[PDB]
Design a protein around this ligand. Structure first.
Ligand SMILES: Nc1ncnc2c1ncn2[C@@H]1O[C@H](COP(=O)(O)OP(=O)(O)OP(=O)(O)O)[C@@H](O)[C@H]1O
Ligand SMILES: Nc1ncnc2c1ncn2[C@@H]1O[C@H](COP(=O)(O)OP(=O)(O)OP(=O)(O)O)[C@@H](O)[C@H]1O
Ligand SMILES: Nc1ncnc2c1ncn2[C@@H]1O[C@H](COP(=O)(O)OP(=O)(O)OP(=O)(O)O)[C@@H](O)[C@H]1O
Ligand SMILES: Nc1ncnc2c1ncn2[C@@H]1O[C@H](COP(=O)(O)OP(=O)(O)OP(=O)(O)O)[C@@H](O)[C@H]1O
Ligand SMILES: Cc1cn([C@H]2C[C@H](O)[C@@H](COP(=O)(O)OP(=O)(O)OP(=O)(O)O)O2)c(=O)[nH]c1=O
Ligand SMILES: Cc1cn([C@H]2C[C@H](O)[C@@H](COP(=O)(O)OP(=O)(O)OP(=O)(O)O)O2)c(=O)[nH]c1=O
Ligand SMILES: [Mg+2]
Ligand SMILES: [Mg+2]
Ligand SMILES: [Mg+2]
Ligand SMILES: [Mg+2]
Ligand SMILES: [Zn+2]
Lengths: 699, 699
């Protein structure tokens, strides 16, 4: 009946076990278990709760709780405990409040240090600006806020899928100069790259060009018409048209080449390359087919004189039955080319047109690392898919919720509901803070139709995202460790644990549905990728809960809901087992990786896996061993070590001569020039092949 | 011969006047000036110096203690305690510079650029040697761009060896790319190269003789077109066709470059300063490239044909090539003249005058920073591939005010400040030498500075033997001349001898320093980035209003003629030709304002020809403003903080186009309004040839 107000302000519940555990840790800090002490501590714990429910009756602040516990335990003739209690209190408070911009950092790039310092000062200011309880929980790692380096210090926006059709149809303004529709395809891709540059400068997330072929076809047609007019002017009467064709094809290639190099040599205010993506696969006429062929060709040819594989843009390849799925369909050549590209380089992904439409709500290329949106017919009734955004994400700790329960389901749900309360508060604060961005502040995104509509300076920014137009995502991770700590390491054979995971995901989805219906903004459960947050998550978890079996001894946390990477099942059963996790209602973001051996000579196996996977689950990623050592000339996979990689034959590790690329985030990266955290390193080292076969290509 | 160590590190000579002045000033704040009181203070100061002379190397804290004790013995409390409190107030303000600075329309990327700048400035001020730090903060000198340096070992500007990169290939981001095969790829490579260079140096960037090194790639493109037309067109017009096609291609390539400069936004968020130099076209391809660049500049940017504020265009005039009407390049100069009267750019550079002034001809880097003739160990002259290392500006007008109309003490204090500046230069170059090539591999170990280095080797080997340069700046020759020899000193000859003596002493000091430290130090005329604002504000606060010195709330830039009176351009040039030839060689430019020169560029041609033999660098300031609401061309009336059309009055940047030359690069005030230290000087700029400044009214 009584309720407790907290240092933060959350009307948390009241219990008697937590105080006991607190005194036990306090006593163990210096004194050993000492069964006498261990047993006597129950006595003064019960004395403390007796004091609180006899003296106070309704609303207790933390202040009096602290005073009562110290006053009562002092008389236990146990000064070696009270002093340590106050010691821990003061040391924490000092360490928590010693998080100001006075932080000292007294072989890397130059702009990266400046942006690192800017991010540090932004983090300090933001943590000083956040609401109390959410900030406290983030500091203890109960929930992981996202991108403190940019938000909420500034009204940033996470990731938006640009509407290039509106740009290239109506024109826009960049820097000092406005632009009119392009008159060719080379200029078209050039200004597409420029828009990518400016948008990525004015945000902190992804940049996805959806259905590039469909909106790039008319400009290729314009180029072909111009070339045909020139041919009529000069070329002979017998073979004009062919000329155009051939020349047009070359132009297409040229244009795409520019793109493949323009956004590869592009660094924002952050020294890190912005995360981008391209999508294609809905081509009917000749021009779209040629543009897809050109994109795949420039990808497979590689970059540089050393034929090094490319990292960006992210490439997807939508697959639609009756268009590019079967040998009879008039696109099998495009699928063959894309499949060869897949077996040679770790790209592209696939989009199951029919099943993604059925499950997600419509057909929308993965905006950013993995966040899919939701269908949204507009005011006029026409569905709009280009111009949406994502106001933010934030990870909510599942495994700590599980492991704090200590083998009880009933406690799990109440801690879950409380966390969700904190997550709701954080979500509301983030969207409200974003809602305070003047359009004139960043005209590239608002004032000139980046999000699909053009708004005057005097207008506000709510009109762009209201009525479930924008999305805010809430995130989860660890499903496997939750199920393992609750039902044992090997739980996939049984069904009760799987129903447990399905039920908890369903509860999350229902909570997001209620929130979305209440606040009018769309809220979706979203499988947050582990770029480097998994290392901080694991480190805080092992600092708080020690070392436990199979949950933390791996120094990393299994991303989202994927199978345990230590296990090696066939891909078929992997998709069969995972097909229901996002189907149940977790469609916010998903990515299924099936591990291969080197199939450059046998990409037919990859083809079979992709086909079978059409009806099971939409997204699909491929991990083929494609690294290479330039000095000794070797291709295949590299044996991981302790804090890097090395080629099994020699051992050269200098990135100047060895190209290794691993699917570290949802987007792959180079673990040689940008040494990531220890956790991702260990997790990559643990990944186990998922299809038996040869790996080494040429020693 | 008594030595006193100053507060920080200076061993300045001792005097008794400053002691009186200090006591008099300490009396002024409360006690009003009266002959009795000032005579009392003089007696006290005489007592103080008597006590001082009552072993010869005294500290400063001792002097402060002495003055406190004697002022107390003078049986007056107000002045002494006020002096002490002024000392505490200043010291608290001297220490108030800490990251804690709270900065709690301003586009997203900026705010963090500004915060990083303030943090770097605070760290650098706390880092650099003490005495020059005090000199800088007190306004004695100005250290340039304290935000970027010496927090990071940056560099000012350079002539990137575009020839070396485009010949032997280079690595950018993740791709090691070899030489191009077409002019479009060549200019795309140039744009990417400069974009990635600008993220590794604070100051400007430039490329010289662009056509001269771009000719072979134009030839390659023409060869490819001819080969492809060998079988695809009739035998008679084949060659002709190629020509036409190649011409258009060249235009296209250059077009791309222009826009690819406008869309550059580094971590600073302000477009990097960038200059292009050409004019040595001999064969057909270089002529075509020059024509293309001039055409793409006159045609403007965007559908609104708004002028390009960037990049800088420098056109070199050579006798016997593009000067006489019979010369083989007069049409190129006609296009250049039309471009110069329709838009601000380009500027000029006489071959003979420049090669005589600074050894060997080379386009300036940055705003106006020039170089000196250099030869390497192999006796081969090279200009592209050498770099600057930043400037620090002196303050002549402060010295003039401190002289109190006395010539003899002026040179003593000037020598003192000169030594301070030497210490500053030495520290800056030493700090730069502490960098490592791996910091910015593009800028150092991939040809951007000429020689290609290795990781294991340092960078000093790229700077010794007077290859790099460390320029030292000056400002306000007119200010000191006006303070000394009256306001109207132009007709007088003695004052001219005096100011040229200042420049000569500066040159001699620079020459001695260069001979000693093995790095080419040079005199320099500082571009008014922000120096006018800060210098004028500090001088007005300290020395108060002075007629024709600070009442204009602006400081005359370098040696330039007075901006408040209008002589004929020919006589301006004949008066100004003495300054750079006398030794002011490190950087210069001669502004020459004209009315609307449309429908008659003959006056512009005449002044250019007249300025060939006299000076090296000259710029034109014809009014080019335009307003779109009422369709007006001409000039805009300055106002308290901006500009507007004299007919209607609209002033927003979205519909007006006002451009006025500041610090070399044009810049548009409506986009980014400069501080009110320059805006009061551009308003004070007076047309320098009679004629209408309007071109067309609207309604
Ligand atoms: N559920 C609970 N209700 C009330 N008091 C509790 C509960 N759990 C622990 N306590 C008591 O709260 C005391 C305060 O812990 P602490 O000093 O961290 O304060 P706090 O308000 O919890 O601050 P924080 O949120 O930063 O942890 C503990 O020493 C313990 O005795
Ligand atoms: N060595 C120790 N380790 C853990 N806790 C200790 C130790 N020594 C004393 N303590 C006390 O036990 C408390 C346990 O931490 P905490 O504040 O998180 O607990 P709680 O308040 O019950 O948790 P919550 O804040 O989530 O309600 C410390 O805040 C401190 O008061
Ligand atoms: N030329 C001089 N030589 C010696 N003492 C001087 C001279 N000029 C002024 N002083 C005395 O030095 C005293 C100390 O001045 P102040 O408190 O500014 O210290 P400082 O060493 O000059 O520091 P800073 O260099 O930062 O101004 C003055 O009050 C004045 O009496
Ligand atoms: N109102 C006032 N204005 C100026 N100086 C004052 C005032 N009141 C007291 N003073 C004293 O007079 C000093 C004059 O400035 P400062 O100390 O820089 O003189 P200085 O030592 O002669 O110059 P420098 O440090 O450049 O050699 C102040 O630092 C302070 O000690
Ligand atoms: C090269 C380039 C062009 N543009 C813009 C400028 C124009 O508004 C626009 C259309 O450019 P283009 O398609 O080049 O059109 P154009 O009018 O020059 O005609 P042509 O077909 O003869 O070339 O693209 C950019 O915005 N950025 C760039 O980098
Ligand atoms: C388009 C582009 C190319 N490049 C580089 C890649 C290559 O190393 C180099 C030459 O490009 P290209 O001359 O286009 O090379 P290519 O092999 O495609 O030949 P062709 O044009 O005859 O089909 O330019 C950049 O560095 N940046 C760019 O934006
Ligand atoms: Mg607590
Ligand atoms: Mg090519
Ligand atoms: Mg002083
Ligand atoms: Mg064009
Ligand atoms: Zn090897």
């Amino acid at each position: 009946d009584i309720k407790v107000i907290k240092r933060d302000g959350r009307m948390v519940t009241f219990d008697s076990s937590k105080i006991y555990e607190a005194i036990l840790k306090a006593s163990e800090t210096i004194t050993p278990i000492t069964p006498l002490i261990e047993t006597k501590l129950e006595g003064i714990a019960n004395r403390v709760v007796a004091e609180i429910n006899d003296r106070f009756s309704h609303n207790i602040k933390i202040y009096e709780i602290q005073s009562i516990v110290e006053h009562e335990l002092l008389e236990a003739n146990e000064y070696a405990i009270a002093q340590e209690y106050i010691n821990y209190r003061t040391k924490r408070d000092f360490e928590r409040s010693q998080a100001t911009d006075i932080n000292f950092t007294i072989s890397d790039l130059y702009n990266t240090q400046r942006d690192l310092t800017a991010g540090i000062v932004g983090k300090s200011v933001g943590l000083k600006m956040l609401p109390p309880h959410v900030a406290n929980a983030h500091q203890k790692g109960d929930i992981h806020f996202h991108d403190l380096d940019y938000s909420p210090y500034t009204p940033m926006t996470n990731c938006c899928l640009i509407d290039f059709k509106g740009m290239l149809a109506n024109g826009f303004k960049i820097g000092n100069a406005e632009v009119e529709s392009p008159k060719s395809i080379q200029t078209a891709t050039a200004q597409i790259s420029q828009i990518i540059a400016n948008v990525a400068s004015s945000q902190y997330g992804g940049c996805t060009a959806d259905r590039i072929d469909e909106f790039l076809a008319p400009y290729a047609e314009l180029n072909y018409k111009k070339h045909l007019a020139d041919a009529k002017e000069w070329v002979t009467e017998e073979k004009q048209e062919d000329y155009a064709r051939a020349k047009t094809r070359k132009d297409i290639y040229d244009a795409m080449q520019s793109l493949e190099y323009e956004i590869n040599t592009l660094f924002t205010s952050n020294g890190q390359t912005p995360f981008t993506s391209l999508g294609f696969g809905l081509g009917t006429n000749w021009f779209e087919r040629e543009i897809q062929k050109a994109i795949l060709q420039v990808r497979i040819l590689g970059l540089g004189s050393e034929h090094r594989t490319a990292i960006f843009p992210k490439l997807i390849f939508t697959l639609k039955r009756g268009l590019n799925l079967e040998p009879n369909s008039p696109n099998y050549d495009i699928k063959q080319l894309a499949l060869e590209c897949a077996t040679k380089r770790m790209y592209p992904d696939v989009l199951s047109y029919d099943k993604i439409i059925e499950l997600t709500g419509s057909f929308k290329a993965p905006m950013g690392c993995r966040s899919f949106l939701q269908g949204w017919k507009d005011e006029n009734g026409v569905e709009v898919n280009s111009g949406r955004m994502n106001l933010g994400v934030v990870t909510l700790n599942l495994p700590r919720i599980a492991l704090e329960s200590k083998g009880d389901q009933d406690k799990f749900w109440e801690i879950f509901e409380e966390r969700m309360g904190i997550a709701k508060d954080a979500l509301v604060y983030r969207v409200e803070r974003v809602k305070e961005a003047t359009p004139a502040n960043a005209p590239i995104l608002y004032q000139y139709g980046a999000f699909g509509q053009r708004l005057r300076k005097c207008d506000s920014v709510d009109q762009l995202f209201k009525h479930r137009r924008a999305t805010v995502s809430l995130g989860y991770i660890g499903l496997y460790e939750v199920a393992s700590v609750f039902y044992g390491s090997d739980w996939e054979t049984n069904l009760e644990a799987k129903t447990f995971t399905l039920n908890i995901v369903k509860a999350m989805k229902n909570a997001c549905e209620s929130w979305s219906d209440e606040y009018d903004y769309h809220f979706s459960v979203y499988s947050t990728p582990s770029e480097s947050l998994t290392d901080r998550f694991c480190r805080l978890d092992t600092e708080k809960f020690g070392v436990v079996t199979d949950i933390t001894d791996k120094e990393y946390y299994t991303n989202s809901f994927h199978y345990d990477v230590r296990k090696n099942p066939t891909p078929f059963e992997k998709l069969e087992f995972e097909k229901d996790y996002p189907e149940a209602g977790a469609t916010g973001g998903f990515i299924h990786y099936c591990e291969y051996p080197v199939l450059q000579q046998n990409p037919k196996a990859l083809e079979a896996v992709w086909d079978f996977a059409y009806d099971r689950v939409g997204y699909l990623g491929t991990n083929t061993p494609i690294d290479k050592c330039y000095k000794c000339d070797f291709e295949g996979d590299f044996t991981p070590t302790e804090r890097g990689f090395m080629c099994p034959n020699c051992g050269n590790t200098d990135p100047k001569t060895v190209d290794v690329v691993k699917r570290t985030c949802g987007y792959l990266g180079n673990p040689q020039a940008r040494p990531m955290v220890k956790g991702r390193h260990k997790e990559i080292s643990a990944r186990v092949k998922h299809m038996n076969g040869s790996t080494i290509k040429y020693g």
